Design a binder for this molecule. Sequence first.
Ligand SMILES: [Mg+2]
Ligand SMILES: [Mg+2]
Length: 288
Amino acid sequence: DTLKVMTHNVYMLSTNLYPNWGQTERADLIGAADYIKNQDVVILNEVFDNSASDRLLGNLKKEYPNQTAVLGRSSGSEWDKTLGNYSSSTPEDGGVAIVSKWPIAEKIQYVFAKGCNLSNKGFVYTKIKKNDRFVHVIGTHLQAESPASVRTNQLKEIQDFIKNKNIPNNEYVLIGGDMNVNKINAENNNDSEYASMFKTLNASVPSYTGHTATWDATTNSIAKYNFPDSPAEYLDYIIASKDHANPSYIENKVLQPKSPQWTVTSWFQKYTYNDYSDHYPVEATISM
Ligand SMILES: [Mg+2]
Ligand SMILES: [Mg+2]
């Protein structure tokens, strides 16, 4: 069998702080997009805006009916457990959610202890039954660019959680999302943060295919507006724990899907874009 998992930072900032980023329309464009189809599990990042995020989740309901709540937005029975530094008084939620075409046996949220109370950043854990197999998928979004030291602490909390969970070593355990750890020009430096990421989580390095960056101001219309001169970076991953079932093959493919044109007005000026987010999605293929 093959497991298909995708992760995508969808840039859905709160409309209370950023009213004109086309969040609602992109909720519809992403929901109907072909690139996000045919997956087993999908991890979402930055689904911060409550209305637009729920709209997106609703549009994905037909194909991915099994869904978790958004990390850090609530702490009721919608979560089997709410772990970590969760606060109901944080201005924003963690923006992470997971949807699947398969039954979800357990849903857990965990809020990171440290961070440079702004957003309940952390991770979402899911135990999913796919064809009589239980697979484990953790979705997260780490500290954005001292920042590296914070990310290492967060990665540590993720690894510590996995070990404590007592997951069978013959079942697949994947960790994915916007790690904010750059692979560009770092794949050949055992001392880079990119290298440390794999050590801290004790995960294997996947085969890389597709586009060469996940946040590219040189090809992405949204990133180009916000950071015109910033060199492209590679920050999104989906990797497997070596302390559990090691995939004979695991790929991470960066896609460059373009959306139908959409327009927004900001300060009496109209702007048109053809991207779903400032980040590109990463499609993982895992041989089981
Ligand atoms: Mg972002
Ligand atoms: Mg929110």
